[PDB]
Amino acid sequence: MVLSEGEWQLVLHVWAKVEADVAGHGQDILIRLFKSHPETLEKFDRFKHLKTEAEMKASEDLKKGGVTVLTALGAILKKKGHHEAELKPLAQSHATKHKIPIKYLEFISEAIIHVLHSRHPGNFGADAQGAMNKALELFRKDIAAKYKELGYQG
Numbered sequence: 001m002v003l004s005e006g007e008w009q010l011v012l013h014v015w016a017k018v019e020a021d022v023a024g025h026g027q028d029i030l031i032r033l034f035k036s037h038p039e040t041l042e043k044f045d046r047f048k049h050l051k052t053e054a055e056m057k058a059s060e061d062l063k064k065g066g067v068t069v070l071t072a073l074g075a076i077l078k079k080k081g082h083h084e085a086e087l088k089p090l091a092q093s094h095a096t097k098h099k100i101p102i103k104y105l106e107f108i109s110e111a112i113i114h115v116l117h118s119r120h121p122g123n124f125g126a127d128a129q130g131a132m133n134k135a136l137e138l139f140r141k142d143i144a145a146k147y148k149e150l151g152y153q154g
């Protein structure tokens, strides 16, 4: 698929807001993913044991991990689709080492959209949410095809 330049503009304009506080956005986003789909917390051997939102809010590794996720996602969105090299290493550890089904990437994509909608209502209107949904579906589609090449899922 392919995003038009104006859709990439809408995506990178919200993202530029998220970047003003990458760690608080990553915390929000992972906590929302783990509240909504608790099974996903199990994939994290270093947090797995956190029992409440309060413990999550208080954990520095969880905050470190959100920052890692968002920074890697922001570097892929800024390529505007030419992200082949950035996805290769990524698709290799998630398929072979961590073992994150595509289903799990769809869930987090949901949690990202939820959080941006809450924090950025003025910059996250329907059109911008459509463009971000599109950019994220494009991410998942290219990752799923890499997974297939590596021997996972597909």
Ligand code: HEM
Binding pocket: 040, 041, 043, 044, 045, 046, 065, 068, 069, 072, 073, 089, 090, 093, 094, 098, 100, 104, 105, 108
């Ligand atoms: C937008 C989606 C994602 C991006 C771009 C992303 C990115 C990354 C990156 C850059 C790392 C560190 C380097 C490496 O291990 O590859 C990481 C590690 C990891 N990711 Fe992902 N990831 C995402 C989604 C997921 C999801 C949805 C889950 C699972 C329920 C997941 C679970 C993990 C785990 C378990 C690690 C290891 C944590 C640790 O022990 O340090 N990832 N992720």
